[PDB]
Amino acid sequence: GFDRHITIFSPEGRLYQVEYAFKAINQGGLTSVAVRGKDCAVIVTQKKVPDKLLDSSTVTHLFKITENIGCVMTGMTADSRSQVQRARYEAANWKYKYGYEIPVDMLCKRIADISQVYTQNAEMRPLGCCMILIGIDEEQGPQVYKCDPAGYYCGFKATAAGVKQTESTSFLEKKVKKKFEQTVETAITCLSTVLSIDFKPSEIEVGVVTVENPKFRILTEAEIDAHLVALAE
Amino acid sequence: NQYDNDVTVWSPQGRIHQIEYAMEAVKQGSATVGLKSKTHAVLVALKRAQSELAAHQKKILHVDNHIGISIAGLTADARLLCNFMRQECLDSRFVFDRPLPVSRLVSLIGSKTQIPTQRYGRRPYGVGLLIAGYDDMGPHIFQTCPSANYFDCRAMSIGARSQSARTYLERHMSEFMECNLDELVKHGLRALRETLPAEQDLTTKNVSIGIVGKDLEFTIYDDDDVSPFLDGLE
Amino acid sequence: GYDLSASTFSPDGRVFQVEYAMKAVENSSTAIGIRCKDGVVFGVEKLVLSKLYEEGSNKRLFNVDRHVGMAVAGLLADARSLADIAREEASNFRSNFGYNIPLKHLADRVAMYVHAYTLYSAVRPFGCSFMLGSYSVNDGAQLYMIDPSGVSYGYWGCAIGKARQAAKTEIEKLQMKEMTCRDIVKEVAKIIYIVHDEAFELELSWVGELTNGRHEIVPKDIREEAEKYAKE
Amino acid sequence: VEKVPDSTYEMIGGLDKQIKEIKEVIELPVKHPELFEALGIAQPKGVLLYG
Amino acid sequence: SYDRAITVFSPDGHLFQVEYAQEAVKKGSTAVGVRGRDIVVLGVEKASVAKLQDERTVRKICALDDNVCMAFAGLTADARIVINRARVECQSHRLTVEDPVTVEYITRYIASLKQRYTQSNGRRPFGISALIVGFDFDGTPRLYQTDPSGTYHAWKANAIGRGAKSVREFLEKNYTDDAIETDDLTIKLVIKALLEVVESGGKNIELAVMRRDQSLKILNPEEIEKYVAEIEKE
Amino acid sequence: SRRYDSRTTIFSPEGRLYQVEYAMEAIGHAGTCLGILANDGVLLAAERRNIHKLLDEVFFSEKIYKLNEDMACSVAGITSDANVLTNELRLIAQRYLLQYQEPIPCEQLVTALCDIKQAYTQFGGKRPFGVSLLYIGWDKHYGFQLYQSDPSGNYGGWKATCIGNNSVSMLKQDYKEGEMTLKSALALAIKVLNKTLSAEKVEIATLTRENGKTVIRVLKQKEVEQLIKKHEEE
Amino acid sequence: RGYSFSLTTFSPSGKLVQIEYALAAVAGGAPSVGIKAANGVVLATEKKQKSILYDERSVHKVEPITKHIGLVYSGMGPDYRVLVHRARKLAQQYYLVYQEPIPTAQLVQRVASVMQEYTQSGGVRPFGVSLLICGWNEGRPYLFQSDPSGAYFAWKATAMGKNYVNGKTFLEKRYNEDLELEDAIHTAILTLKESFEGQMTEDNIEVGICNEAGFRRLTPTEVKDYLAAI
Amino acid sequence: DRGVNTFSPEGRLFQVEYAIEAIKLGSTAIGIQTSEGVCLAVEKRITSPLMEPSSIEKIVEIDAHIGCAMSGLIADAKTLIDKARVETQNHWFTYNETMTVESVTQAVSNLALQFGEEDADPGAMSRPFGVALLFGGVDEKGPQLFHMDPSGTFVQCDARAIGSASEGAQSSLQEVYHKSMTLKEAIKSSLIILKQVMEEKLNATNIELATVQPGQNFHMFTKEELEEVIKDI
Amino acid sequence: DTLDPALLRPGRLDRKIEFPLPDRRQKRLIFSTITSKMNLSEEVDLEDYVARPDKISGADINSICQESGMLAVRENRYIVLAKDFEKAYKTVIKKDEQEHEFYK
């Protein structure tokens, strides 16, 4: 009966809502690629303003969870801010409930788990946005994670998210088997080799964290402009 | 018609597909007409007799202490809505100790009948109120609707074939903001006397009217008291 | 039949109860809002049906918190509902945190309210696009616009309604940044009279240095001054 | 045409209860109907071979 | 928390869930009772409980408290709930007024209960039908027969089982004044009425009698045989 | 939504219950474990799942469950549900003790479980408990007794009834109702299971006593190799 | 909010349609073996990601329930993580009331109890994760498996996930009742080695043992050690 | 199917216009308000003759001076007859006086169109009350009878017929009543039942008649009074 | 799958030969042959792309190896070293599928 209507099991498994929710994150498509540095988890994404009538500062993906965790999401932007507000809620709730500021992994476990209970119960749709989110803890290096709308966080080096995910992860897989704090030949060049725009410093948003300075920083056209003119080797 | 399980759904053009059909369900109801002057607003209703004979299912209602209504649609649902409107109008008599203004009255019932339009498995309040009252400024008159979208109107007619009463009443707005009670209610009854099936009389039985405004309570004129309002031949 | 329920996706990921609500504001009149350096000027098209409705029969420029505004587009019942709970939301902010509500937080709050209201088969989505707008003494002339999907963007000259396909072009060709709002109140009528291609009894409200963070229907004099932009 | 049926006779690999029961109900109702019309039996017909 | 409205009006005024319960009482045992003017008497043709039953727990005949007792017919497991709630509120009505509780009141409680399950949100109104017999403070051996629509009738035969339209037309034919005696002609009328339907009482029938607010006595198959033999002898 | 509900608590147009008799066909797929009582105590006789080596040790099996000192139960049908309900009914047993300091005469327990299982098929919109489990027990009131229930809700004293596939008719030509002499009840149990066999693929369990307190034995391994050679012919 | 009607229901044949679909979603899951051994068990599983891109020290499939009980799955991804959350909570209710680490049998009672009501109770679909249990519990080790129905069985060896018929037949061939320590690990490795889709990488398998001192995951330097000793 | 709170492509609710049916099903009742009382009668349609006919309650006294007369789906009225008498003695309790008939009729008809699937606690109603009835009562205004619907619509009535004879008996009653009681409205109303006759010539076993007169409180007629009236016709 | 169920019947065919869409112990031999009729400069590896065994014919082995040579015609090269192998393979080394995480 209602296999493609309700989040229930069809025959041969394959519940037909999460891959209908995966196809929802490709709608429009403003595309993030995250770069990890043995000391610096940089963030990259592309962002297109339609008509020079939007306020370009207000449109972003690039949200800040706390003073150590940033995030970027490529899903349908209606479902984005409902998901990032609960992640801010569980970050501040972790810091009030368990003392120390939340490390990056089980935050993504927890929002992956409420996305699971979206895709476990009926009468709610699994909201279509995936959370590329970075951050540094005291013990290990910089980390990066992505919970999907099914709740399967992995623990990545360098995936991507949005339209043209496969070309991006193919480029990163071909360009990580060679061995990068500057990330000048990796971060932007995944975008400029996948979709071939060779950006001016407007349309790209970059959010770094460093081990020397773990505060999440969103960069501006000055430093990303020096970062782009460093592609003259 | 898969849009029959249907105050949650949208027709693919723009249509919510049954709370405009509740607007059909008050087009089906009996005809009435209210209007306003510069001083006092009036309400006039003809009452259908679908029986032996009756009080003809008395339409215009006492809610208030000068904020009177005129129902036209379901009657039990109308009485539920005027027990709401009645009870919180008396609650504003209780707490603030002033007359509740007519605009906040019609706005918060416009937020009360708006909730079942929103949620699941709950029909809209299929009744078209034609409320009228005299607050601090001039005597307002509000059509509200089962689509929860009221109108700060003047001289509105709703009910069965009430569009002809509107098109009489639209081309006779110039002699409003004057035209005292004795010549105003004549001007409303000859606006009502077009929704009738073209055979001759606004009788004293079926016509019940209501007057509200400066220095007079919302006053109901029933079977006897409508007889001093008599004129017109067409 | 992958339609008729907001908790069910399309086979290509497109929740049809949202895009059916989006055309449900595309069959309603325009309401443009133009930002400039001293505040945000609204202007709403009116489509006065009969002579029976008086002036301001239905308010479509509501206000919320004594400074942000509510130029709405779609169903006036739904827009009036989220208008009054926006009033309650800035009420809970001013009562709760004391400080007068910054508009970005109110647009994100009402935005996630109307978004989280589109995740359930037990509710319908709203059928009303609407926009906000104000400025504090150090805020800038912030305005935002919110779809029935729940997405909220900061704009300069956003326009929602039926003829927004026409209306976005003139606001784009109008000089946007550096003029002092009084002229653009006057210039708003030029946009409204162009996009009305058929009583057009329009209505304007703003917030500005002539207001100091408030709202007024115009005061009432540009209604006989911006009416003189007929014959253009 | 459907030359599928391949001539077979008695080379069945070790089935004797089965051939006793099918020969009990496939040549007795053909070549000796006389003891069925005097035994009170109406007619045996239709055999299901499940295996 | 299940809140779907099951028992809803279809077209032509037909409340299909209740008539589906009417086939559900049409597909049960064959219960029967006689108001015999000083005694009351039941009977329900039982199945093959001798092969391997326990006769103690095959009881279509129960007892409410001491005088009122009922014979259900249909679904035989939704009935036991109504037995339990009848016994509970029957003890509560011994708590308040302290009477040998009248049969009218407890059968109004049963009919009101089943009518309350023709109203609530999603709970399938019962497929049982009762024979509330008994007495009161002054003799009066009143019998009552309820219904899945919650309608109780104070009739005097009410064979309401599965093949019991023939039994109630037989009892329409053969119950005028010949059964006004103590027990023998009444019980003979019952065992004649169920021996119309099936076979001999050594395997099938079982009965119960009640005499003047004492001694609710069932009849073991040794005693039923004597009556059966008399009927056979006729 | 009302398009999505399975609507379990609906009568058929033939009057029956669709989700209930689908549980009755769930018993015929998987189910064994007859039970025989005697003048002495009562036994279950059961079958495990298959021949699959890969099974280390069951303390009690997945079939026979202990409930009190003087009761036990066996399970047919879906094994995931009944586990829950048997812990559920186990709670019932102990709280009767907490209310009465009695070892809960087993008909009280079967009545309670059948009332809650009837409550799951009455309302709530859920699927019924797909298990026709049965019970053995003793009380000081009655003798050794076994009861048998089903997902519909009714139950009974079912002196030799089996559950599951290949349905008990041979037992109602072989059981001597007066005296049974429980060793020969074991012999009849391995007769029936020998037609439908060591303790790799059988699970037989007896209930007996010594000096008043009941003893529930699960009939450890070598006793089965005794009884399996207690045949020649059968 | 909520539904309060069961979506799992009975077929006209007389069986649960959702539960056999759940066993289909289990049978399309990653293969995992579990071998009960004379002093201790081994629960191996197969972690094949999409590319060589992810952190193989980030997510686990062997993970304990708080004392000496690990549990490994095969099937749906995050429904497992819910069952670990519920299982740890039930083990800590038991630990705070009875002041001992939970017997493995009772943990399988309560995990099979919580997986049952998702075959009922208001719109929820059943989990579709047939995870299997280990545990030392006093004297002799235990092993179980809670199906998405809610049943559970104890044995000496099993497999699950992809092509588990070959795992059950192959473990039926090579099992001894005294086969106890690292030989079990050996045959577990050559049960995953049977298919694996290729090359038997130590970062793509992880095992967990219950060697009478608490369940513990094996470090990646120990699996590759016995992958050198193949 | 569709639910209960939906409007029909004719214009009205489904369950209400379906609740107008199952009033044609069921027995017929009539009532006549006069200037010195109000008479009610109902032919309660006994099925078998093996039985007791004087316990089919279709004339039910709400109070001493309000008597109702239901039809249609019988015994569905007992909850709202219960609400009628409980509301009646609540009015006499809190206000120490008699009532009107539009206050009991006002109070019962609020419960008619008050149902729904997903609402408050499950003690609410699912289907509307499929029983049409009319309260014959005497007041300090006057004797009067208020014909209810299952829609909650109640009207002033002086000569109203319900049940299956809602057309022929109503049209016959339309031409035979104008003046007053003077003892013969109760004999010119069972005459309408005499034209209605379904099974039996309207003896004192199959019709129940009761009048409410301003001098007395009510009078449910016994057998010899009824057959005293039937002898006069 | 739809041939005819009367085309065999032991007389018209009597046989049936499955062709396997080959795997590990065969795929290596296909690469060994098709590379054995080309110019190689031993920067290539053999079993690295025998690895990732995922749903190949022999025809697409001839496509990725033929495509490797033709992608080496860009720089007018008479051999193939590193990228044209890997390069063509990834480009059309099954132009991917569509996984599907969680289950698996």
Short mmCIF file of C-alpha atoms in Angstrom, two decimals, chain H residues 54-210:
data_model
loop_
_atom_site.label_atom_id
_atom_site.label_comp_id
_atom_site.label_asym_id
_atom_site.label_seq_id
_atom_site.Cartn_x
_atom_site.Cartn_y
_atom_site.Cartn_z
CA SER H 54 -46.09 -0.48 27.82
CA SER H 55 -42.32 -0.16 28.13
CA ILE H 56 -41.41 1.49 24.81
CA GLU H 57 -40.65 4.94 26.21
CA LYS H 58 -41.25 7.50 23.48
CA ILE H 59 -43.02 10.09 25.63
CA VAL H 60 -40.47 11.09 28.25
CA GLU H 61 -41.08 13.79 30.84
CA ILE H 62 -38.04 16.05 31.19
CA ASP H 63 -39.50 17.89 34.17
CA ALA H 64 -43.03 18.07 35.56
CA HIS H 65 -43.89 20.70 32.94
CA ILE H 66 -41.69 19.65 29.99
CA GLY H 67 -42.39 16.43 28.12
CA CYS H 68 -40.47 15.40 25.03
CA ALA H 69 -41.43 13.11 22.16
CA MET H 70 -38.56 11.52 20.28
CA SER H 71 -38.40 9.31 17.20
CA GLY H 72 -35.88 8.12 14.65
CA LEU H 73 -32.85 6.30 16.01
CA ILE H 74 -34.35 5.55 19.41
CA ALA H 75 -32.26 5.41 22.64
CA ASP H 76 -29.65 7.74 21.17
CA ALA H 77 -31.65 10.50 22.88
CA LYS H 78 -31.06 9.20 26.42
CA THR H 79 -27.78 11.08 26.82
CA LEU H 80 -29.38 14.37 25.82
CA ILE H 81 -32.59 13.63 27.70
CA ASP H 82 -30.22 13.08 30.62
CA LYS H 83 -28.62 16.43 29.83
CA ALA H 84 -32.11 17.93 29.57
CA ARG H 85 -33.21 16.85 33.03
CA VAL H 86 -29.82 17.46 34.67
CA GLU H 87 -29.80 20.93 33.16
CA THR H 88 -33.40 21.36 34.32
CA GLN H 89 -32.72 20.61 37.95
CA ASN H 90 -29.51 22.62 37.70
CA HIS H 91 -31.64 25.59 36.63
CA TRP H 92 -34.14 25.04 39.44
CA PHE H 93 -31.24 24.50 41.83
CA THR H 94 -29.24 27.61 41.06
CA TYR H 95 -32.15 29.94 40.25
CA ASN H 96 -35.09 28.62 42.37
CA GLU H 97 -37.71 28.81 39.63
CA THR H 98 -39.24 27.00 36.69
CA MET H 99 -37.79 27.12 33.22
CA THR H 100 -38.78 28.11 29.73
CA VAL H 101 -38.88 25.60 26.93
CA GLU H 102 -36.25 27.52 24.94
CA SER H 103 -33.78 27.10 27.78
CA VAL H 104 -33.95 23.31 27.82
CA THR H 105 -34.25 23.40 24.05
CA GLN H 106 -31.40 25.91 23.98
CA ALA H 107 -29.34 23.60 26.18
CA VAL H 108 -29.98 20.33 24.33
CA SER H 109 -29.50 21.73 20.81
CA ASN H 110 -26.01 22.92 21.75
CA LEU H 111 -25.08 19.25 22.12
CA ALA H 112 -26.38 18.29 18.68
CA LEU H 113 -23.73 19.80 16.41
CA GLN H 114 -20.93 19.15 18.89
CA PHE H 115 -18.83 16.18 17.79
CA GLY H 116 -15.63 15.44 15.87
CA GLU H 117 -12.82 12.97 15.32
CA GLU H 118 -9.69 14.67 16.71
CA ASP H 119 -10.73 16.93 19.58
CA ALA H 120 -10.58 16.83 23.38
CA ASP H 121 -10.81 13.67 25.60
CA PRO H 122 -12.61 10.61 24.11
CA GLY H 123 -15.77 11.16 26.14
CA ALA H 124 -16.85 13.36 23.21
CA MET H 125 -19.21 12.26 20.45
CA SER H 126 -18.35 10.90 17.01
CA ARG H 127 -21.59 10.82 15.15
CA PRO H 128 -24.32 13.46 15.56
CA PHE H 129 -27.37 12.48 17.56
CA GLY H 130 -29.67 10.95 14.98
CA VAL H 131 -32.85 11.62 16.95
CA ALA H 132 -35.35 14.36 16.17
CA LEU H 133 -37.56 15.33 19.07
CA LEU H 134 -39.79 18.09 20.34
CA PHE H 135 -40.33 19.42 23.84
CA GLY H 136 -43.98 19.90 24.67
CA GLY H 137 -44.02 22.24 27.63
CA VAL H 138 -46.05 24.89 29.41
CA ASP H 139 -44.50 28.19 30.49
CA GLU H 140 -45.41 31.52 31.98
CA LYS H 141 -45.23 32.80 28.40
CA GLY H 142 -47.51 30.07 27.08
CA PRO H 143 -47.81 26.41 26.17
CA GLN H 144 -45.55 25.75 23.19
CA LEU H 145 -43.55 23.01 21.56
CA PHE H 146 -40.05 23.33 20.15
CA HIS H 147 -39.20 21.06 17.25
CA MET H 148 -35.52 20.18 17.18
CA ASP H 149 -33.43 18.79 14.36
CA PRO H 150 -30.25 16.71 14.56
CA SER H 151 -28.57 19.85 13.20
CA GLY H 152 -29.16 21.79 16.41
CA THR H 153 -31.80 23.90 14.65
CA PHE H 154 -34.83 24.29 16.91
CA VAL H 155 -37.98 26.20 15.98
CA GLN H 156 -41.18 27.42 17.58
CA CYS H 157 -43.96 25.05 16.67
CA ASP H 158 -47.66 24.71 17.29
CA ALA H 159 -48.40 21.75 15.00
CA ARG H 160 -45.42 19.61 14.04
CA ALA H 161 -45.05 16.04 12.78
CA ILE H 162 -41.88 13.95 12.86
CA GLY H 163 -40.93 10.43 11.86
CA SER H 164 -41.88 8.64 8.66
CA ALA H 165 -45.16 10.58 8.52
CA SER H 166 -43.44 13.93 8.13
CA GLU H 167 -45.08 14.79 4.80
CA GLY H 168 -48.61 13.37 4.66
CA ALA H 169 -49.36 13.81 8.35
CA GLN H 170 -47.78 17.28 8.34
CA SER H 171 -49.85 18.33 5.32
CA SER H 172 -52.97 16.91 6.96
CA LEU H 173 -52.11 18.73 10.18
CA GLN H 174 -51.56 21.92 8.17
CA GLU H 175 -55.26 22.20 7.31
CA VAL H 176 -56.98 21.01 10.51
CA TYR H 177 -55.55 23.27 13.24
CA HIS H 178 -56.19 26.93 13.87
CA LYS H 179 -58.22 27.62 16.98
CA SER H 180 -57.66 26.10 20.47
CA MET H 181 -57.84 22.84 22.41
CA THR H 182 -61.40 22.63 23.80
CA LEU H 183 -60.70 18.89 24.42
CA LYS H 184 -60.78 17.92 20.73
CA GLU H 185 -57.26 18.56 19.47
CA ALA H 186 -56.19 15.32 21.17
CA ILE H 187 -59.06 13.61 19.32
CA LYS H 188 -58.25 15.30 16.00
CA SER H 189 -54.60 14.28 16.30
CA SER H 190 -55.01 10.55 16.86
CA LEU H 191 -57.35 10.88 13.87
CA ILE H 192 -54.20 11.85 11.96
CA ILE H 193 -52.62 8.76 13.51
CA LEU H 194 -55.77 6.92 12.33
CA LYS H 195 -54.97 7.95 8.77
CA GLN H 196 -51.32 7.03 9.29
CA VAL H 197 -52.09 3.43 10.42
CA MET H 198 -49.36 0.90 9.65
CA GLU H 199 -50.24 -2.33 11.44
CA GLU H 200 -53.24 -1.96 13.74
CA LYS H 201 -56.30 0.21 14.28
CA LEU H 202 -54.65 2.49 16.91
CA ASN H 203 -56.00 0.86 20.08
CA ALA H 204 -54.69 1.53 23.58
CA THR H 205 -51.63 -0.71 23.12
CA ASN H 206 -49.68 0.83 20.22
CA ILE H 207 -50.03 4.61 20.68
CA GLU H 208 -48.77 6.64 23.63
CA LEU H 209 -50.37 10.02 24.19
CA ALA H 210 -49.63 12.61 26.85
#
